[PDB]
Design a protein around this ligand. Structure first.
Ligand SMILES: Nc1ncnc2c1ncn2[C@@H]1O[C@H](CSCC[C@H](N)C(=O)O)[C@@H](O)[C@H]1O
Lengths: 8, 245
């Protein structure tokens, strides 16, 4: 994900 | 009649006399920010802000908030972003955020601008809001990192972005969360926030006490084992890794 703060 | 308070998990609330169906509808409804003092007071329909005037909660008597309206004619309404419109009033600042943070040159090397605290606050303090246009993970993930400086994952369906030219405060200053720089030893976190003007977004919340004029930082939390991350971050990730043997 090329975004801040994604949940993995 | 008495009065009802409905709190969000973030500490903000809606307060007022509800109508016959338990709905926050009327002319004397307020949203109260998490400081339990700054308020947007006026006309709401089923909890949606139609005309909220800036006010200060002065006291509560028998549960009923007593407000004073602030001077000026600062008025706000529900104005959720779309995929193409960040705000109806891009230059209208958030009154809560404006008292807590400001933008200046970052103290981090070559990092451009950063977000700074205006005053000393305790842990768990909401400081800033991260509003932006709402686009898909497909669009963001399938485009180059140079376009992804300000992208923030909101949930499994939506990414919030502050695309050029709105990344400059002279063009957009309604919210400032996109101005917080990254740290692997941060003093703030991102947290879900339900905002009366912006709708469901994220905020920047302190995880410890912060001093006046301290730079606010957050861990951007890019995937290190997909590192799917911009170059500056990869460079800084290796350093961080060095620092703890
Ligand atoms: N720890 C860090 N080191 C270097 N650059 C950083 C950084 N944290 C954030 N940045 C910069 O900030 C961008 C994310 S948005 C942060 C606000 C930005 N500094 C601005 O002036 O608008 C990144 O693309 C990168 O340019």
């Amino acid at each position: 994900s090329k975004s801040k703060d994604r949940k993995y | 009649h008495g009065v009802c308070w409905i709190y969000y998990p973030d500490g903000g609330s809606l307060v007022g006399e509800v109508n016959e169906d338990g709905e926050m509808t009327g002319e004397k409804i307020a949203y109260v920010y998490p400081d339990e003092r700054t308020a947007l007071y006026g006309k709401f329909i089923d909890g949606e802000m139609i005309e909220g005037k800036l006010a200060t909660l002065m006291s509560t008597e028998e549960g009923r908030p007593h407000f004073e309206l602030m001077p000026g004619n600062s008025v706000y309404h529900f104005d959720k972003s779309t995929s193409s419109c960040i705000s109806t009033n891009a230059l209208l600042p958030d009154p809560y955020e404006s008292e807590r943070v400001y933008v200046a040159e970052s103290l981090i090397s070559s990092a451009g601008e950063g977000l700074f605290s205006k005053v000393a606050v305790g842990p768990n303090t909401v400081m800033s809001f991260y509003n932006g246009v709402r686009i898909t993970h497909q669009e963001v993930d399938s485009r180059d990192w140079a376009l992804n400086g300000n992208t923030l994952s909101l949930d499994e369906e939506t990414v919030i972005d502050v695309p050029e030219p709105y990344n400059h405060v002279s063009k957009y200053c309604a919210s400032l969360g996109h101005k917080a720089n990254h740290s692997f030893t941060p003093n703030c976190i991102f947290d879900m926030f339900v905002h009366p003007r912006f709708g469901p977004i994220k905020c920047i919340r302190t995880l410890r006490a912060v001093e006046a004029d301290e730079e606010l930082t957050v861990a951007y939390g890019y995937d290190h084992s997909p590192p799917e991350a911009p170059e500056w971050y990869q460079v800084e990730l290796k350093a961080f890794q060095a620092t703890q043997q």
